[PDB]
């Protein structure tokens, strides 16, 4: 009785809560392609190779449409591609909003504009003798641009502003004060969707649109109640565009945080039970510092979440049978993924680094990260077989690109928490393309069994449909 075993999502218990939790694939990307005798094949995440150096760790990335080049802020120095195009203060994550006449990075509570001719100007009120309206700018939290205006939100308050059309440094001449007052919720983050200026409150999401008013003093932007979403973002950087909309993490005010996607003025969950348990495992401040972003390559449309001790990834194209989350990691133990702030420029993707002061470009023919080994895990779900025997356990692997004949450690559990002996089987052979990963004499399933496939290699691993001859 040749019985297939899925590996797109592994399942097992949790020794603390005694609850069944999903054992997520690690450094794998399920690809819904009709492969041989299976409906999909697991593909290792692309490796990272150092393109060139940088000053300090990476703090942000934005693809400047105006100059057709990527602007990346690493450490305390702002970089445009290879060159150094200005000095940025601060140490925490920074939000940028590129413009046609200036590239800006809201840092240290002030919106700093790096003009394209070299000069630097900071947002401040109009001069008192000018005669235009005087505001209370306060501290800048998040920024965005829409129709030639920079929109930023005062820190710790639900008010957001817009810059003037003529002189972009100062705010608008007469009408530059706007509030997300539908609820007593402070604005945690701001952004642009289509032609709307969103305003992610601590408990609500509002959409703003231009009214086209001409008379001086009239409110340029008017709220759009019909598009309101009654959820919120956990932290300032827990939002990102994803599938022609913004995904986010729910603020604890509305309930337990969980990854959401905005649709037609409504929030639809895309986080399984295990994902939201992992998210809830964090404290408020730790989860506030989390940042999430979108990465798209091949057929996958990833939604990478950079949590302090986890890096969850949502693969949109592989969610045919349900949400598909893979936990990326760096190193042999449970360290956090180093790659951060992915952006696709020119021909190949480039990503910053959380620890070192370097930038890496994704390379698809290797899985090593900065010339280091990495761990790929694959768990099969627990299934009840009583007094049965299993002999043939075969997984199809695309062999040949490897450097050395790397081997995988194959182990099976019986209670779903702790595992047995690690059996070592060759998985790739350098430049041999027809090897089969076959293990015989698996043994007898007493009550339950679950197989963990662990591969330690510097080359991509492509595992396909797993067949077990449960005789």
């Amino acid at each position: 009785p040749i019985q297939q075993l899925p590996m797109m999502k592994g399942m097992g218990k949790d020794f603390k809560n005694a609850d069944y939790i999903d054992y997520l694939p690690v450094n794998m990307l399920a690809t819904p392609k009709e492969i041989l005798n299976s409906s999909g094949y697991l593909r290792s995440f692309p490796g990272i190779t150092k393109r060139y150096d940088m000053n300090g760790v990476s703090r942000g990335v934005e693809y400047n449409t105006a100059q057709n080049a990527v602007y990346r802020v690493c450490g305390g120095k702002l970089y445009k591609g290879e060159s150094e195009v200005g000095d940025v203060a601060g140490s925490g994550r920074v939000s940028m909003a590129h413009g046609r006449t200036s590239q800006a990075v809201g840092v240290n509570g002030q919106l700093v504009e790096y003009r394209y001719d070299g000069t630097v100007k900071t947002v401040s009120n109009w001069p008192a003798d000018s005669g235009f309206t005087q505001y209370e700018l306060g501290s800048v939290r998040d920024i965005t641009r829409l129709r030639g205006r920079y929109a930023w939100s005062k820190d710790g308050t639900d008010s957001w502003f817009i810059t003037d059309l003529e002189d972009e440094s100062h705010p608008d001449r007469y009408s530059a004060q706007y509030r997300a007052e539908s609820q007593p919720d402070g604005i945690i983050g701001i952004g642009t969707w289509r032609d709307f200026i969103v305003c992610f409150g601590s408990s609500t999401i509002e959409y703003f649109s231009l009214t086209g008013a001409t008379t001086a003093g009239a409110a340029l932007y008017v709220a759009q109640p019909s598009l309101m979403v009654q959820k919120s973002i956990a932290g300032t950087y827990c939002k990102t565009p994803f599938a022609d909309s913004y995904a986010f993490i729910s603020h604890p005010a509305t309930g337990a945080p969980s990854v959401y996607i905005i649709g037609s003025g409504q929030a639809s969950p895309i986080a399984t039970a295990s994902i939201e348990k992992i998210i809830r495992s964090y404290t408020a401040e730790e989860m506030a510092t989390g940042v999430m972003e979108t990465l798209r390559f091949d057929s996958h449309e990833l939604l990478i979440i950079h949590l302090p001790r986890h890096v969850l990834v949502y693969d949109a194209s592989s969610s045919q049978n349900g949400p598909q989350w893979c936990v990326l990691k760096t190193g042999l133990y449970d360290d956090v993924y180093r790659g951060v702030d992915f952006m696709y420029e020119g021909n190949q993707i480039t990503c910053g680094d959380k620890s070192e002061a370097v930038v890496g470009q994704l390379q698809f023919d290797i899985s090593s990260q900065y010339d280091k080994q990495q761990e790929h895990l694959l768990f099969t779900p627990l299934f009840k077989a009583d007094n049965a025997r299993c002999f043939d356990l075969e997984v199809e692997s695309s062999t040949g690109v490897a450097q050395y004949a790397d081997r995988l450690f194959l182990s099976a559990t019986t209670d779903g928490i702790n595992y047995g002996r690690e059996q070592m089987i060759e998985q790739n052979e350098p430049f041999v393309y027809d090897k089969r990963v076959l293990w015989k004499r698996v043994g007898r399933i007493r009550r339950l069994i679950g197989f963990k496939l662990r591969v330690i290699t510097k080359s991509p691993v492509t595992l396909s449909g797993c067949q077990i001859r449960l005789e």
């Binding site: 133990y333 449970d334 450690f409 182990s411 559990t413 209670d415 702790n418 595992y419 047995g420 002996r421």
Partner: protein
């Protein structure tokens, strides 16, 4: 330089003959106290491949080769520092009542 490559999984043989204690029992408890009493028993941990520590029931089992074997196969049992020992064979007799394992270190001047 300062770590020995050794037998990683310990061998529990019998006192009166050179044979492994098949289906033996080891109990681990507080210093200089009887570890059979459940109150005296101290936490005992498995160290699986993930680096986790999952605690298991105190009557650890011994296979036919002298190693410690969980419900399935070989595991790397872990205790804190001061573990007492009591080997009981399946028949119910006693083999060892090592009170303070820390007092079995080949160099007790260090302590």
């Amino acid at each position: 330089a300062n770590v020995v490559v050794s037998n990683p999984r310990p061998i529990f043989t019998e006192s009166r003959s050179f044979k492994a204690v098949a289906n033996g029992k080891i109990y681990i408890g507080q210093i200089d106290t009887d570890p059979v009493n459940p109150a005296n028993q101290i936490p005992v941990y498995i160290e699986n491949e993930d680096g986790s520590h999952v605690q298991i029931t105190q009557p650890l089992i011994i296979n036919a080769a002298g190693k410690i074997v969980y419900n399935g196969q070989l595991v790397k049992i872990v205790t804190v520092q001061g573990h007492s020992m009591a080997i009981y064979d399946a028949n119910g007799s006693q083999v060892d009542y090592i009170a303070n394992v820390l007092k079995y270190d080949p160099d007790q001047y260090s302590i």
